Design a protein around this ligand. Structure first.
Ligand SMILES: CCCCC/C=C/C/C=C/C/C=C\C/C=C\CCCC(=O)O[C@H](COC(=O)CCCCCCCCCCCCCCCCC)COP(=O)(O)O[C@@H]1[C@H](O)[C@H](O)[C@@H](OP(=O)(O)O)[C@H](OP(=O)(O)O)[C@H]1O
Ligand SMILES: CCCCCCCCCCCCCCCCCC(=O)OC[C@H](COP(=O)(O)OCCN)OC(=O)CCCCCCCCCCCCCCCCC
Ligand SMILES: CC(C)CCC[C@@H](C)[C@H]1CC[C@H]2[C@@H]3CC=C4C[C@@H](OC(=O)CCC(=O)O)CC[C@]4(C)[C@H]3CC[C@]12C
Ligand SMILES: CC(C)CCC[C@@H](C)[C@H]1CC[C@H]2[C@@H]3CC=C4C[C@@H](OC(=O)CCC(=O)O)CC[C@]4(C)[C@H]3CC[C@]12C
Ligand SMILES: CC(C)CCC[C@@H](C)[C@H]1CC[C@H]2[C@@H]3CC=C4C[C@@H](OC(=O)CCC(=O)O)CC[C@]4(C)[C@H]3CC[C@]12C
Ligand SMILES: CC(C)CCC[C@@H](C)[C@H]1CC[C@H]2[C@@H]3CC=C4C[C@@H](O)CC[C@]4(C)[C@H]3CC[C@]12C
Ligand SMILES: CC(C)CCC[C@@H](C)[C@H]1CC[C@H]2[C@@H]3CC=C4C[C@@H](O)CC[C@]4(C)[C@H]3CC[C@]12C
Ligand SMILES: CC(C)CCC[C@@H](C)[C@H]1CC[C@H]2[C@@H]3CC=C4C[C@@H](O)CC[C@]4(C)[C@H]3CC[C@]12C
Ligand SMILES: CC(C)CCC[C@@H](C)[C@H]1CC[C@H]2[C@@H]3CC=C4C[C@@H](O)CC[C@]4(C)[C@H]3CC[C@]12C
Ligand SMILES: CC(C)CCC[C@@H](C)[C@H]1CC[C@H]2[C@@H]3CC=C4C[C@@H](O)CC[C@]4(C)[C@H]3CC[C@]12C
Ligand SMILES: *[C@@H]1O[C@H](CO)[C@@H](O)[C@H](O)[C@H]1NC(C)=O
Ligand SMILES: [Ca+2]
Ligand SMILES: [Ca+2]
Length: 1371
């Protein structure tokens, strides 16, 4: 909308830079604002606020220039639309205030996003991120359906249960400060003497967490899906209803909601990243990278060649000819391996020296280390100068390695002077010298893989920096939005939480915490509480839901894409140089023959990632002693090995029944006799295995096999335990109790014997070998962080229970603790924090806890409040220490962990399958042909027993009006289950129940109507029909009983699943992954054994700890071993290991299991001697092993369906072939198996390529494919179902399509042999059915169609042929 073209003036480069500058200034101004409660302003607020007219005027001016120049193509760009709305909303608020316009100020948060619009480079990177998450939307649709279904189920069971508590008998007052749900029955929690269970209490978490509405249930379910706070619901519902069945709701909720969805997200993303790599634009960048590396390798060889010759030439520089030679002499020494290894050994000493430091080191140690730092610093500075003079200033500095040595040397000087100026702060910068230890990988074969990874990372440094900036920008926008929504609103009566949005530094760290998903629910409760409460502030949960939902998967997308792309580049880059080096050597040796002519392990076959990646490259490019013989005999006997397997199974079950709490329980007395028998069986099999084999190392030694030692340990420990008990039963209880623990190795004896369980075990060990080299780098980097953390926070993690006292001497005596309406006297104690950094070993445990993500907000709070050594905390003292934990998250949890996930995906090997390159085809041609081997037309009845009645009523059942009626009722029926709510009137409850009777009637008619139409037998052969039938039968059952609990009507809640069949891509994705879990049963078994072994160890070691202990102190973090969480039974142990696997405060459980804890009343121990220091190893190893085994399960399921995940719609695939089946069912309604060919051409028109011709295909081109079919034509006009499906696949995939003539005679002979070679199981007659034996007598499918296409080309010419003479005749 302009005056056409009239002196329209365009932009010049400084203009957009001025715009960029003003945007950055506006961002700073927004970041400098502080919000105060209740209409209070800071003095700087007015000065910052009055700047808004200038910024809005500049933005309006630039928008005006652009709008007049383009002419209002301004709104064509999406970025300009975002710019326009920013300008529009600002002017409305800035100019005029009559309407309520405080809300419109919230739109200013989007202004930082104008950086993306201004900088075109950021737009390209932003396009990459959004492109990958387009497929992920279909996962979100599965996630929403899962949440909806579980919200309905939770609504039915848990509606309103949490509103009763232990009220005082006399008054309507809560008994204690912390209330819990109660019950009036024994299974539920019972109130003490002084109280009773009264009707109304607000509920847990101030009533925010509950199941009262469908909206409350959906929000509550979403919280459990994120695995944050889900155990508190499990314990609360156990108090209300008893613990018999509540685990059936929550355990499936976590597995399906959290672990299964995470599997699809990794699967879909990994497939997308594989397809992105083989894009034409991405391949060209890699090809440039490969060529540039080849130049560097060759150039390095030539540089050393001339360098050696230059020294050959060399043989007051003129007088001191030696002066040139000392430069040459020490140049030699630098190169020598003696120098290289000697300086490297010095680095090991320096790395050791900085690790010794601890909180109270002896004074002699401090003096030694104080001088040793100068000695090490002096040696490395001298080592700098020797290379500088020895190699020259220019050659030295140009080396990348030497520049890094310069930085640490310069940094080390900075620290020592900094210590003198400002004593009290040491950063331990010298530890960065330990990174030189990674050069040791050069001697190994692993250097090529590691160097190439760093090469690829440095190549894409520009992309990585842009990715982090965009990720940082979205944090700033959400931080600014949080300040607007929750400003000075967190000033609660109790106090202002540490996580508040008052200031910009506080808003970033609160937003960052929600992204990591730790205690995001706790922050949500504060945000809801600030705005009214549960009554009025429930709409503010959307800010937290969107932030954690988007942040969870945006972080995964950004960091996994970085890891996959760079690791895949390194693998290809490494493989190419190895084959290039091999090929060049063979060529050189061949050339060596001409010169002399005058006188003349096994590498695994690629991987699932590499094999698929190579195929996509081709397809894209193509388109462009008498006793011993006895002892050997028993071992051969299958009954013996089958018998011993049964004994192993029974031995494991015995370990699970034993009662830990009662050593003298009657059950343990009975089970003790069983222990004698099981050892006896294991003793007998041990000796005969020694007799059949040999103890001595004769290459068949019994002790040679590793599992044999494992068998030897179990039996030996049991025998020795008997000897100690034999002498005196209770002389030494400690060691015998330790030896009894070795029985937990009995389940591991199963792995060797079961063949497929051993195979799964070898795959897990194979994965460890691949990631071992990265694992060493991971620990070296984590070691550096631990040493730095020690220097920062050594001795500063001390506090006094009395806040005021900040020294140990002051913290003595008693103090007054002011609780609500009561004063209590408590002792003053100078105690250390639970997790601290007093040495490198304590630092690593603390950082490991932070890596798992649990409890790090508390560790961060302690880190910022630390003041000085041996002095107490002060709130907000050092707020710059937050940078330590932000940098730590970027490196290890975000970056290294996704390298571990990527590395396993790229290097995963095939599941057996023998060799698989002997057959030429392989690839995806198998799956399509395999389907063609086994297929059948979907039989549609067409009974004709009674055309008027029975067939007619059939056509109604299949009629679209009936089907859409079915979908409408199921949709309406679901909404009926969604309208239950707490406090509904008896009229409302009755009205809802009436609609149930209406629906269950109609849903019964559908079953009656289908059964008659389909028949008694055919109907009952479809899984959904039985599922539908059991659902109607269950619902109708309850109704009669009421007039003459209905949790089996929640089967009707599962009817919503039927709606999934309409959405195709979801149904295939859900079905394929489910099938993959069935094909991998032993992988699931390995995870079950890990839980079994760790459960039995927990019962024997940590079972004795008492739970009855409770006191007014109520240090809940101190005591996490309670009635709900303990090791007392096998099932109570498994729940503890599942809570820890999800990560719910596992670090506090580990501390609760340590030594010096009260024992149980009946444990038989009368002193406070319970728990072990084994709790450190018990939990730390479990978290590593549980995450590793679960990850291998994920990749196994992902890499099983990797063909589908990396599918392309253009190229034929097995998923397409199902479309052929439904079409064939209709054109052949009776499913005769024979269809006349006049229907066939119409069939090909209906289906899109590559399976069908498609609507817009040229007729003559369509005829070309028809000849390509080359199949015999039946004289009844029919085409076989199996034979026809074969050729359509062959035509599309170009599977050895012959040039014609004699070739067709050979390929049919050939292809039939491949399919015979692949499977000899297929029937020969059926094999000839799919591919007919060649018969030139039978006319091909082309021949009938060749009648039209060849003649129609002539037929149009025939009219022109008669024409050609005709105008010539007239002329
Ligand atoms: C992304 C979110 C957060 C990321 C940060 C988190 C974490 C940071 C990234 C972590 C991922 C690291 C993965 C594995 C890292 C190291 C494994 C082994 C290190 C390694 O491979 O060694 C060096 C680094 O030097 C150091 O001493 C070690 C100095 C440390 C350098 C490693 C990090 C550099 C990566 C760039 C940063 C990535 C960004 C990398 O090797 P290079 O890239 O320097 O390659 C040289 C180069 O090609 C030269 O021709 C030659 O060396 P000089 O002639 O002596 O200079 C060598 O070639 P040839 O051997 O073929 O003759 C190579 O050594
Ligand atoms: C099995 C080998 C390992 C499999 C691991 C594979 C993946 C690991 C996933 C772990 C799943 C956790 C399973 C938790 C089972 C039940 C946990 C529980 O809290 O039990 C509660 C209920 C009460 O029984 P309980 O507490 O044992 O004693 C009676 C009164 N105290 O106890 C019960 O009534 C439950 C009885 C049956 C439970 C399973 C059948
Ligand atoms: C690169 C790696 C292999 C270096 C070697 C490991 C060190 C980082 C660790 C291993 C064991 C640790 C030690 C384990 C226990 C102690 C005892 C601790 O002394 C006390 O508890 C009290 C001392 C006193 O009061 O005299 C001092 C630290 C020290 C030596 C630790 C220092 C750090 C050490 C040497
Ligand atoms: C999942 C696989 C590995 C099999 C499941 C093994 C355990 C979960 C089961 C198997 C036998 C069960 C036990 C069989 C019998 C009893 C007695 C039963 O009676 C009692 O209350 C104790 C007896 C008494 O009071 O004298 C309590 C549960 C318990 C220990 C059971 C606890 C759960 C056990 C150990
Ligand atoms: C994904 C990654 C790249 C984004 C991580 C965001 C960081 C850039 C943010 C998050 C926490 C922030 C810190 C939070 C707290 C402080 C203390 C504060 O410095 C003070 O001394 C303020 C005094 C006070 O607040 O009492 C402001 C800077 C700093 C280090 C902040 C610097 C910027 C940090 C590291
Ligand atoms: C060999 C495999 C099956 C081990 C199975 C042993 C289990 C099933 C048997 C063996 C010993 C049995 C216990 C022996 C002792 C008692 C105490 C008695 O007053 C009640 C039954 C009870 C609690 C039995 C329960 C079942 C029990 C634990
Ligand atoms: C085995 C050791 C290394 C730690 C155990 C792994 C688990 C407990 C840790 C390691 C990596 C961590 C995750 C790494 C990736 C992300 C980024 C974002 O998506 C949410 C946080 C989240 C989800 C972290 C939460 C917890 C996490 C999954
Ligand atoms: C990637 C490898 C080399 C890790 C080394 C980098 C780590 C150890 C460095 C990088 C940035 C550093 C922080 C930068 C600034 C400060 C503020 C200062 O008042 C206390 C130390 C503290 C908080 C530093 C601690 C150490 C730190 C986190
Ligand atoms: C598919 C869509 C259109 C339907 C879903 C919305 C229905 C099922 C939901 C959304 C809004 C909900 C209502 C919101 C608020 C209240 C008031 C409360 O005192 C009782 C429950 C009640 C009455 C809820 C019942 C369930 C409800 C009606
Ligand atoms: C594979 C495991 C067993 C090897 C690791 C051994 C270390 C980390 C663990 C395992 C067994 C542990 C010991 C087990 C029992 C006790 C008794 C306790 O009152 C003091 C600590 C002490 C002495 C533990 C110290 C730490 C310990 C030695
Ligand atoms: C507490 O209740 C139990 C329940 O029967 C009763 O036996 C006991 O005497 C009560 N205690 C007191 C102090 O009344
Ligand atoms: Ca958590
Ligand atoms: Ca977590």
């Amino acid at each position: 909308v302009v005056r056409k073209y009239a002196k329209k003036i365009t932009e010049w480069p400084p203009f957009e830079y001025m715009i960029l500058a003003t945007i950055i200034a506006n961002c700073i101004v927004l970041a400098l604002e502080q919000h105060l409660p209740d209409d209070d302003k800071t003095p700087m607020s007015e000065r910052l606020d009055d700047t808004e007219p200038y910024f809005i005027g500049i933005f309006c001016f630039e928008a005006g220039i652009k709008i007049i120049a383009l002419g209002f193509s301004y709104l064509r760009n999406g970025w300009n639309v975002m710019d326009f709305v920013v300008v529009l909303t600002g002017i409305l608020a800035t100019v005029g205030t009559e309407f309520d316009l405080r809300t419109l100020r919230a739109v200013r948060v989007l202004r930082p996003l104008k950086l993306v619009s201004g900088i075109p480079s950021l737009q390209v990177v932003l396009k990459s991120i959004m492109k990958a998450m387009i497929p992920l939307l279909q996962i979100g649709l599965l996630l929403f359906f899962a949440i909806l279904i579980f919200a309905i189920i939770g609504l039915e069971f848990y509606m309103g249960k949490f509103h009763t508590t232990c009220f005082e008998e006399g008054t309507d007052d809560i008994q204690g400060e912390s209330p819990a749900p109660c019950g009036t029955e024994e299974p539920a929690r019972t109130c003490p003497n002084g109280t009773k269970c009264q009707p109304y209490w607000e509920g847990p978490n101030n009533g925010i967490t509950q199941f009262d509405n469908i909206l409350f249930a959906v929000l509550t379910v979403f919280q459990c899906i994120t695995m944050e706070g889900w155990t508190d619901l499990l314990y609360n519902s156990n108090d209300a209803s008893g613990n018999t069945w509540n685990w059936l709701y929550f355990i499936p909720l976590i597995i399906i909601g959290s672990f299964f969805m995470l599997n699809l997200v990794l699967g879909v993303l990994s497939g997308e990243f594989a397809k992105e790599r083989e894009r034409v634009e991405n391949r060209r960048a890699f090809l440039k990278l490969r060529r540039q590396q080849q130049i560097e390798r060759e150039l390095n060889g030539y540089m050393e060649w001339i360098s050696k010759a230059e020294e050959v030439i060399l043989a007051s520089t003129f007088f001191h000819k030696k002066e040139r030679r000392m430069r040459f002499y020490i140049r030699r020494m630098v190169k020598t391996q003696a120098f290289y290894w000697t300086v490297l050994s010095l680095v090991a000493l320096n790395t050791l020296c900085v690790a010794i430091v601890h909180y109270n080191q002896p004074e002699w140690l401090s003096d030694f280390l104080y001088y040793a730092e100068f000695i090490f610093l002096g040696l490395f500075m001298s080592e700098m100068f020797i290379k500088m003079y020895g190699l020259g200033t220019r050659p030295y500095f140009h080396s990348s390695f030497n520049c890094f040595d310069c930085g640490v040397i310069i940094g080390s000087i900075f620290e020592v002077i900094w210590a003198v100026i400002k004593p009290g702060t040491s950063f331990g910068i010298s530890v960065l010298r330990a990174l030189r230890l990674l050069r040791i990988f050069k001697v190994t074969k692993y250097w090529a893989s590691l160097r190439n990874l760093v090469v690829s990372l440095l190549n894409s440094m520009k992309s990585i920096i842009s990715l982090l900036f965009l990720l940082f920008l979205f944090i700033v926008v959400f931080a600014l939005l949080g300040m607007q929504l929750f400003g000075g609103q967190f000033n609660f009566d109790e106090g202002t939480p540490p996580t508040n949005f008052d200031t910009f530094p506080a808003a970033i760290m609160t937003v960052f915490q929600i992204l990591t998903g730790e205690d995001w629910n706790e922050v949500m409760y504060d945000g809801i509480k600030s705005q009214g409460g549960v009554q009025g502030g429930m709409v503010f949960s959307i800010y937290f839901i969107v932030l954690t939902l988007f942040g969870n998967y945006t972080l995964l997308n950004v960091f996994l894409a970085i890891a996959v792309d760079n690791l895949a580049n390194a693998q290809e880059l490494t493989k190419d140089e190895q084959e290039e080096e091999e090929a060049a050597n063979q060529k050189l040796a061949l050339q060596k023959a001409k010169e002399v002519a005058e006188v003349s392990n096994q590498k695994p076959a690629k991987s699932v990632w590499e094999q698929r990646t190579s195929e996509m490259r081709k397809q894209n490019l193509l388109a462009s002693n008498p006793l011993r013989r006895l002892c050997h005999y028993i071992l051969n006997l299958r009954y013996f090995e089958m018998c011993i397997l049964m004994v192993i199974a029974m031995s494991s079950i015995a370990l699970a029944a034993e009662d830990p709490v009662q050593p003298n329980a009657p059950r343990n007395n009975v089970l003790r006799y069983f222990d004698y028998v099981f050892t006896g069986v294991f003793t007998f099999e041990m000796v005969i295995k020694m007799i059949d084999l040999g103890l001595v190392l004769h290459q068949g030694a019994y002790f040679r096999d590793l599992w044999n030692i494992l068998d030897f340990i179990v039996v030996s420990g049991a025998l020795v335990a008997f000897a100690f008990t034999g002498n005196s039963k209770g002389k030494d209880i400690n060691t015998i109790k330790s030896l009894r623990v070795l029985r937990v190795l009995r389940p591991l004896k199963t792995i060797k014997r079961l063949p497929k369980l051993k195979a799964v075990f070898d795959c897990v060990v194979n994965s460890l070998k691949n990631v071992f080299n990265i694992l060493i780098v991971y620990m070296l980097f984590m070691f550096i962080f631990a040493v730095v953390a020690v220097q920062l926070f050594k001795g500063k993690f001390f506090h006094c229970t009395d806040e005021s006292k900040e020294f140990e001497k002051d913290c003595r005596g008693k103090y007054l603790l002011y609780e609500k309406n009561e004063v209590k006297a408590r002792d003053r104690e100078w105690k250390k924090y639970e997790f601290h950094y007093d040495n490198v070993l304590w630092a690593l445990l603390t950082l490991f806890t932070v890596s798992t993500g649990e409890g790090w907000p508390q560790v961060l709070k302690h880190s910022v409040d630390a003041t000085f050594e041996n002095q107490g905390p002060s709130p907000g003292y050092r707020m710059e220490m937050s940078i330590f934990y932000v940098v730590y998250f970027v490196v290890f949890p975000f970056f290294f962990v996704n390298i571990f996930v990527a590395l396993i995906i790229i290097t995963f090997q095939e599941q057996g399958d023998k060799m698989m390159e002997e057959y030429s085809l392989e690839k995806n041609e198998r799956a399509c042909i395999d389907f063609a081997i086994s297929a059948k037309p979907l039989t549609r009845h067409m009974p004709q027993n009674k055309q008027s009645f029975q067939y007619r009523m059939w056509q109604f059942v299949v009629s679209p009006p009936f089907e859409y009626t079915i979908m409408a009722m199921i949709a309406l029926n679901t909404i009926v289950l969604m309208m239950k709510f707490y406090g509904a009137s008896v009229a409302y409850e009755n009205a809802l129940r009436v609609f149930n009777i209406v629906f269950t009637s109609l849903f019964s008619l559908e079953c009656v109507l289908k059964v008659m139409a389909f028949g008694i037998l055919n109907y009952f052969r479809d899984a959904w029909n039985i599922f539908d039938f059991v659902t109607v039968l269950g619902s109708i059952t309850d109704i009669l009983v009421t007039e003459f609990l209905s949790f089996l009507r929640l089967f009707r809640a599962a009817r919503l699943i039927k709606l999934l069949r309409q959405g195709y891509t979801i149904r295939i994705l859900l079905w394929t992954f489910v099938q993959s879990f069935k094909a991998l049963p032993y992988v699931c078994l390995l995870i079950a054994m890990l839980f079994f072994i760790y459960a039995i160890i927990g019962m024997q070691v940590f079972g004795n700890i008492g739970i009855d202990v409770e006191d007014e102190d109520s240090d809940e973090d101190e005591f996490q071993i309670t009635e709900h969480n303990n090791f007392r039974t096998f099932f109570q142990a498994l729940m503890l290991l599942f809570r820890s696997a999800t990560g719910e405060a596992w670090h506090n459980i580990m501390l609760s299991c340590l030594s010096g804890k009260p024992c149980d009343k009946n444990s038989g121990i009368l002193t406070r001697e319970c728990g072990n220091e084994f709790a450190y190893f018990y939990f730390v190893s479990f978290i590593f092993l549980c995450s590793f085994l679960m990850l291998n399960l994920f990749v196994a399921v992902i890499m099983d369906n990797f063909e589908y995940l990396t599918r392309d719609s253009s190229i034929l695939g097995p998923h397409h072939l199902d479309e052929y089946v439904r079409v064939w069912a209709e054109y052949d309604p009776a499913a005769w198996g024979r269809m006349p060919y006049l229907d066939m051409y119409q069939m090909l028109r209906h289906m899109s390529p590559p399976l069908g011709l498609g609507k817009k295909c040229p007729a003559r081109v369509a005829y070309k494919r028809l000849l390509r079919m080359d199949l015999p034509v039946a004289d009844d006009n029919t085409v076989h179902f199996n034979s026809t499906l074969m050729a359509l696949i062959r035509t599309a995939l170009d599977i050895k399509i012959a040039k014609g003539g004699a070739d067709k005679q050979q390929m049919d002979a050939e292809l039939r042999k491949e399919m015979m070679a692949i499977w000899p199981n297929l029937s020969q007659k059926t094999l000839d059915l799919l591919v007919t034996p060649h018969k030139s007598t039978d006319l091909t499918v082309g021949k009938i169609y060749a009648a039209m296409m060849i003649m129609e080309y002539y037929r149009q010419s025939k009219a022109k042929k008669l024409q050609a003479m005709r105008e010539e005749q007239d002329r």
